[PDB]
Amino acid sequence: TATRDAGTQVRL
């Protein structure tokens, strides 16, 4: 039930 916030990005 522990979580993390995470971002992704497609980059050129």
Partner 1 sequence: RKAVIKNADMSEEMQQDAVDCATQALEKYNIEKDIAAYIKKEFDKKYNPTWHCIVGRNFGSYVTHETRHFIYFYLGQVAILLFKSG
Distance of closest approach, residue 6 Cβ to partner 1, in angstroms: 6
Distance of closest approach, residue 12 Cβ to partner 1, in angstroms: 9
Number of alpha carbons in the 13 Å side-chain half-sphere of residue 5: 0
Tell me how many residues contact partner 1 (CB under 8 A): 10
The amino acid sitting at 2 is A
Site for partner 1 in 1-12 (CB under 8 A): 1-10
How far, in whole angstroms, is CA 7 from its chain's centroid?
A: 3
Binding site for partner 1 (CB under 8 A): 1-10
